[PDB]
Design a protein around this ligand. Structure first.
Ligand code: JD8
Ligand code: JD8
Lengths: 205, 216
C-alpha cells in the first residue's frame, strides 16, 4: 500500500500516470500574491531563477507527515538505481517535489530533513528542464516493485524463425535448456563487456 | 536546427506530455516536430497482435519483428537515427544528448514486455544508424518513459527550442534571507564575487565527493 504525491508547477506533464494512489498537485495552489510567483533571482549571482522556499514550505507542510519520504529530483542528487527502487517500494508515502528553473532553494530540503526523511536523487547523467520527467521514471520503477503489483539482458526472439533472411539463433529452437541458458549467459556477457564494462569492474570507455 | 522526432509505441497517450511541453515559437519556426505513432497501425491481424512467445522459453512476451519491421520501413529513411531504449543499452548521457541534438531525424522505438525481437534492430542497422541506449540503472515497464527523458534532454539542446528569442552543482538560495531559522550563507550577500566563486567551487567539490565519488 503506497500513496504518492507529486508537487509541480506543470501538473499537465504528469498525465502519463487499489494498492496504490498517485496524486498531482499544482504548487501555485499555495501562493498568495496575484501573480502566483514561485521563483526569484539567486543570491550570490548566476543565471536563471530559484524556486522560493516559502511556497514549497507551505505545500509540504500540508502534504507531508513525519513518515513521508520526500523525494527531490536533482542532477546533483545521489544516483537513483534499482536498489533505490526496491528500498522505496515498501514505503507508505512518497512525496516527489519537482523543481524547475535552476532548482529549489536548498533550505526546503534542509528544513524538511528536520522532521522527515529526505532523498535528493538523480535518474541519470544528463540534463532535464525540471523534475517532472524524473518523477515519472521514479514512479514507474518503484510502483512495479510494490508488493502485489550484474549482467545486461541478452537478445530476445519470437516467430517467425526466419525473417528477412535472418534466423533466430538455432540453439533457441533446440529445446535444450542447458544449452539455451549457456548461450544466453554468453550473449549477456558479450553485451555487458561491450556496453557496460563498469558493471563487471572494468574501466569505462 | 530543424529536427523531426517520430516515436512508435503501443501507448501513444504516454507521449502527449512531450507534444504539450513544446513551445509554439519553435514549432511555428519549423525547428522541431514530434509525432507519435501507435504501433498497432502496423499489425497484420484483426486482433492487432504486437507480441508473441519467446523462443528458448522464459517469462513474458517478445514484440513481433514483422510488425516493427513494417512500422520502421514506413517511418525511417537512410538518414534516420533509430533510437531503441533498452535496459541493456549503452548509457545515454549528456554527451549522447549533445551528439543527437544536431540530427535531422530521430525515430524512437519504444518496446514493452521483454522487448523487441533483436532482428528488428539488427536489420535496421544494415541501412541506417541504430543506437540501443539506457537512461539509467533501474528497470522500467517499457521504453516510453525513456523516450520522454531522451526527447527532453535532446530538444533542450536544439537552438531555439529553449528560446530566449566534472562536478555537481551546489546549493542555490533566494529570498527571504532568513527562513525557518535558516540563513542564506552570508558569503553570497558579501559582494566579494571571487570569494563567492571559491565558496561555490568548494560546495560543488564536497557534494561530488559525498554523492558521486565515481566522478572522481
Ligand atoms: C537546467 N536547469 C539548470 C541546471 C540544473 C538543472 C536545471 C533544471 N532542473 C530544475 C529542477 C530539476 C530537477 C531535476 C533535473 C534533472 N536533470 N537531469 C536529471 N537526471 C535530473 C533529475 N533527477 C533538472 C532540474
Ligand atoms: C521489464 N521488462 C523485463 C526485463 C527487461 C525490461 C522489460 C521492460 N521493457 C521493455 C522494453 C523496454 C525498454 C526500455 C526499458 C528500460 N528499463 N530501464 C531502463 N533504464 C530502460 C531504458 N532505456 C525497459 C523495457
Amino acid at each position: 500500500s503506497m500513496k504518492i504525491d507529486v508537487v509541480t508547477i506543470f501538473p499537465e506533464y504528469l498525465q502519463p500516470v487499489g494498492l496504490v494512489d498517485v496524486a498531482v498537485h499544482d504548487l501555485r495552489r499555495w501562493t498568495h500574491d496575484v501573480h502566483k510567483s514561485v521563483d526569484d533571482s539567486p543570491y550570490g549571482g548566476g543565471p536563471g531563477m530559484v524556486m522560493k522556499p516559502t511556497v514549497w514550505g507551505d505545500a509540504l507542510d500540508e502534504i507531508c507527515t513525519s513518515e513521508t519520504l520526500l523525494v527531490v529530483p536533482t542532477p546533483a542528487g545521489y544516483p537513483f538505481t534499482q536498489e533505490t527502487a526496491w528500498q522505496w517500494s515498501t514505503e507508505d508515502h512518497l512525496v516527489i517535489a519537482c523543481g524547475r528553473y535552476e532548482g529549489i532553494d536548498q533550505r526546503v530540503a534542509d528544513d524538511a530533513a528536520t522532521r522527515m526523511r529526505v532523498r535528493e536523487v538523480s535518474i541519470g547523467d544528463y540534463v532535464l528542464n525540471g523534475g517532472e520527467a524524473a518523477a515519472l521514471v521514479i514512479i514507474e520503477a518503484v510502483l512495479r516493485l510494490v508488493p502485489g503489483v550484474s549482467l545486461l539482458e541478452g537478445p530476445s526472439y519470437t516467430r517467425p524463425p526466419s525473417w528477412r533472411g535472418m534466423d533466430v539463433p538455432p540453439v533457441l529452437l533446440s529445446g535444450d535448456h542447458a544449452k539455451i541458458a549457456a548461450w544466453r549467459a554468453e550473449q549477456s556477457r558479450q553485451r555487458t563487456i561491450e556496453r557496460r564494462p563498469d558493471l563487471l569492474g572494468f574501466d569505462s570507455p
